[PDB]
Design a binder for this molecule. Structure first.
Ligand SMILES: [Sr+2]
Ligand SMILES: [Sr+2]
Lengths: 30, 21, 30, 21, 30, 21, 30, 21, 30, 21, 30, 21
């Protein structure tokens, strides 16, 4: 696997692929 | 955190796996 | 207007749109 | 859960807000 | 719902989610 | 217009609903 | 080469690719 | 309409140009 | 965790994530 | 091929690495 | 068809649309 | 190459067709 430059929805897409059925939490800084 | 790091810098699929349930 | 089916990455893309900086959880096992 | 609510059935963008942190 | 920073195809995705079966018009400046 | 505003500035889902048919 | 099925957001993503700055209309009720 | 042409059936990128403004 | 179905553009999006700068080939006829 | 492996059946991200250049 | 500004996964999406069943090669500079 | 050109400059669907199998 390679390293990743991921902003916005592109991160959520990657989380979705990596985690699949496990699900994931998406937690941005405020 | 991860959201910021992947965008400003770079991150690995292995770092992302930490956010899996 | 009847609603739409959101599955897989499309569902996570929609969560991202609706939630943004609040963040969200995607827990399909739930 | 969300899959049953929004994928198997259909849901509104308001329903999707149920899964925001 | 939160506010949105949306360029290119990401806007069309958002339109698609917001409007669904209603459809939408995509009209960029020329 | 909307296409320009969402990209350069920021826009709401409510502003987008204006472009629905 | 036989063609491909384009549905939902994928269809709108394709319209965006083909039309770009000309813009387009997505009217599924039609 | 476009759903019948491109989703239910299949369509070319040239057919898709029918729906450009 | 059982795995996930990847089709069409989603499959190519996953190849891009996994392969990145190495690049990849998408050859469905194969 | 990849369609049978990953779409018709299911595949891991490790299997997907089979199709990297 | 119009000209295209395409980075990252957005390029792969475009390749996927343009080539469909033919498949394609994705070959970035290293 | 194409990957670089579409991102830094601009490219056409016709240039992309060159990368089809
Ligand atoms: Sr993008
Ligand atoms: Sr899809």
């Amino acid at each position: 696997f390679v390293n990743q430059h991921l902003c916005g929805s592109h991160l959520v897409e990657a989380l979705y692929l990596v985690c699949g059925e496990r699900g994931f939490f998406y937690t941005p800084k405020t | 955190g991860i959201v910021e790091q992947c965008c400003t810098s770079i991150c690995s699929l292995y770092q992302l796996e930490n956010y899996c349930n």
